From Swiss-Prot, chain C:
It is a peripheral membrane protein. It is found in: Mitochondrion; Mitochondrion inner membrane. It comes from Trypanosoma brucei brucei. Mitochondrial membrane ATP synthase (F(1)F(o) ATP synthase) produces ATP from ADP in the presence of a proton gradient across the membrane which is generated by electron transport complexes of the respiratory chain. F-type ATPases consist of two structural domains, F(1) - containing the extramembraneous catalytic core, and F(o) - containing the membrane proton channel, linked together by a central stalk and a peripheral stalk. During catalysis, ATP synthesis in the catalytic domain of F(1) is coupled via a rotary mechanism of the central stalk subunits to proton translocation. Belongs to the eukaryotic ATPase epsilon family. This is ATP synthase subunit epsilon, mitochondrial.
Length: 51, 59, 65, 161
């Protein structure tokens, strides 16, 4: 599967319930992005985490 | 024979340099400068041994 | 350790550990923690007649892992 | 029709320190001990935290280098700057250590070592060992051995103190 998505309801307050999304890329695409965040300046915030 | 411990020492520096550049790709500039610094310091010892060899070879 | 060779996934490994850890908790406190490690889930597809056909693709109980 | 991502509603993000920056001398580690999407401790300044990963035991103090540790069923210790020790027991999970001075220990289950009973733990070990003898197949034996490892760790953890 290219991705697994979860579509749920976020309870902001007693009267506010929005719709929220968790997209989870499968291993192959995730490790490829994790490899680019490590080597490249792109995705700075993820550079340390990826390495 | 002193150069054996010099050339090997240089290889040790560069061997670690590659690993450091792999696990910190966005810090390659500082590591390279330090690697050169270590090479020059070891080369100083190599020249000291070389000078002794020349003194005992040409005199 | 040896469970990886048998195909057991990491997630199933954690569920077994959590159940065992909840087992060791005092009887007074077991009620609180044990509510977090009691399987209550199933996978069902609506049958042709309008019934529930249970999918057996993933185990539910740690015994059957 | 674009939908928000579920992380937009979370206002406590992770701060990473740029590698090309000056160092700071930190005397406090901000710990976040979490169980099943519930924090037992939140950004708590502590002196040190001791965690058992697969390789071995790590003693994390402020300024520890960036590292990810795969925990194993074991005790976890937190020592405050005051001089107070708090001991939990975890069944698994991960520990993320950041060079900025933070440690987010996310566990599937984290229970204070006081809650656990040694008498219950001991007799469970005897029963599971008997179960291992009657284990039908290789898979069943592996599962039973997982339980024994946790139980023995619990028994050994409590016998230590």
């Amino acid at each position: 599967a290219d991705r697994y998505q979860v579509i749920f309801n976020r309870f902001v307050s007693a009267g506010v319930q929005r719709n929220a999304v968790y997209n989870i890329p499968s291993y192959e695409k995730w490790k490829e992005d994790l490899a680019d965040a490590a080597s490249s300046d792109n995705q700075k915030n993820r550079y340390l985490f990826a390495n | 024979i002193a150069l054996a411990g010099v050339g090997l020492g240089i290889g040790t520096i560069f061997g670690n340099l590659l690993v450091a550049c792999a696990r910190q790709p966005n810090l390659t500039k500082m590591l390279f400068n330090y690697a050169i610094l270590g090479f020059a310091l070891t080369e100083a010892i190599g020249l000291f041994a070389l000078m002794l060899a020349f003194l005992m070879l040409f005199s | 350790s040896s469970w990886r060779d048998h195909g057991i996934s990491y997630l199933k490994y954690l569920n077994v550990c959590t159940e065992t850890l909840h087992s060791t908790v005092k009887e007074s406190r077991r009620a609180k923690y044990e509510r977090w490690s009691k399987p209550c889930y199933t996978a069902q597809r609506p049958d042709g007649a309008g019934g529930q056909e249970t999918i057996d693709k993933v185990p539910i109980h740690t015994k059957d892992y | 029709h674009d939908l928000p991502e579920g992380f937009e509603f979370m206002e406590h993000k992770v701060v990473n320190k740029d590698i090309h920056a000056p160092h700071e001398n930190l005397e406090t580690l901000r710990l976040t001990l979490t169980r099943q999407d519930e924090f037992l401790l939140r950004e708590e300044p502590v002196k040190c935290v001791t965690v058992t990963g697969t390789n071995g035991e790590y003693g994390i103090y402020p300024g520890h280098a960036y590292k990810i540790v795969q925990l194993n069923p074991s005790p976890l210790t937190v020592e405050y700057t005051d001089g107070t020790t708090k001991k939990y027991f975890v069944s698994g999970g991960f520990a993320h250590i950041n060079n900025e001075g933070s440690c987010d220990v996310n566990t599937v289950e984290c229970t204070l070592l006081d809650d656990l009973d040694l008498a219950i733990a001991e007799k469970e070990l005897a029963a599971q060992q008997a179960a291992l003898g009657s284990a039908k197949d290789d898979k069943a034996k592996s599962v039973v051995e997982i339980r024994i490892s946790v139980i023995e760790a619990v028994i050994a953890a409590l016998k230590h103190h």
